[PDB]
Amino acid sequence: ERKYLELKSQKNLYLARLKSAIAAQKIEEIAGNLDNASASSLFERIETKILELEAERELLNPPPSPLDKKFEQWEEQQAVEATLAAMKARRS
């Protein structure tokens, strides 16, 4: 009788310790550590899936050249300079 009571007084603690360890392990496989980049952590798999689509839609419709960006920026600067100069000069 006493032996059985003693064993029943420990089954619960052992179950709790097993469950805590299982949950602790199951935490890792989702995120783990930020610097993993292991493609096993579910966040990196989402990140690669994002970048794949972002590049795939870029291939179909090419982005404008940096030369075009420089040209349009300079055109905007020339425009605003002309407006400000004539705008100061009109009230004068």
Partner 1 sequence: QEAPEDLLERLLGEMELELIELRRALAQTIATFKSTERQRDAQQLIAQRWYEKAQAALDRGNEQLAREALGQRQSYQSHTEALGKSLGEQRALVEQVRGQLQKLERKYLELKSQKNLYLARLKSAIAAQKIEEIAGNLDNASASSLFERIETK
Ligand X SMILES: Nc1ncnc2c1ncn2[C@@H]1O[C@H](COP(=O)(O)OP(=O)(O)O)[C@@H](O)[C@H]1O
Residues that bind ligand X (CB under 6 A): 33, 35-40, 62
36 vs 78, which CB is nearer to ligand X?
36
Q: How far are the Cα atoms of 9, 20, 79, 82, 92 from residue 86, in angstroms, in the given order?
A: 92, 75, 11, 6, 10
Could you please report the per-residue DSSP string of 35-91? T---S-SHHHHHHHHHHHHHHHHHHHSPPPPHHHHHHHHHHHHHHHHHHHHHHHHHH
21 vs 37, which CB is nearer to ligand X?
37
CB 33 within 8 A of CB 39: no
38 binds, among partner 1, ligand X, none (CB under 5 to 8 A by kind): ligand X
| Residue 55 is a binding residue for partner 1 (CB under 8 A) | yes
37 vs 51, which CB is nearer to partner 1?
51
Per CB under 8 A, residues contacting partner 1 are 9, 12-13, 15-17, 19-20, 22-24, 26-27, 30-31, 42-43, 45-46, 49-57, 59-61, 76, 79-80, 83-84, 87-88
